[PDB]
C-alpha cells in the first residue's frame, strides 16, 4: 500500500521512494529609481550711447 493525497498509488520495482515534499521558498526583489535634472540660464544685455 502507498498513500498520497487520499489516493492509493503503486510503487514500481525500480523506484526506491517517491515522497511528496513541501520545500517552498520564493524571492521577490523589486527596484525603483528615478533621477531629475534641470538647468536654465537667462542672459540679457543692453547698451545705449
Amino acid at each position: 500500500p502507498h498513500y498520497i493525497l487520499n489516493t492509493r498509488f503503486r510503487k514500481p520495482y525500480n523506484v526506491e521512494s517517491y515522497t511528496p515534499q513541501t520545500q517552498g521558498k520564493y524571492e521577490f526583489i523589486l527596484k525603483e529609481y528615478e533621477s531629475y535634472s534641470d538647468f536654465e540660464r537667462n542672459v540679457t544685455e543692453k547698451m545705449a550711447s
Binding site: 536654465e40 540679457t44 550711447s49
Partner: protein
Amino acid sequence: YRVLFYVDSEKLKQNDFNSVEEKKCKSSGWHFVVKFSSHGCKELENALK
C-alpha cells in the same frame, strides 16, 4: 512559515534659483559757448535655475 521583508524608500529633491538684474543710466548736458548732449544707458539681467 517564515517571511522576510525589506523596504528602503529614498526621495531627494533639490532646487536652486538665482536672479541678477543690473541697470545703469547716465546723461550729461552742457550749453554755453556750444550746446553739448551726452546719454548713456546700460542694462544687465542674469537668471539661473
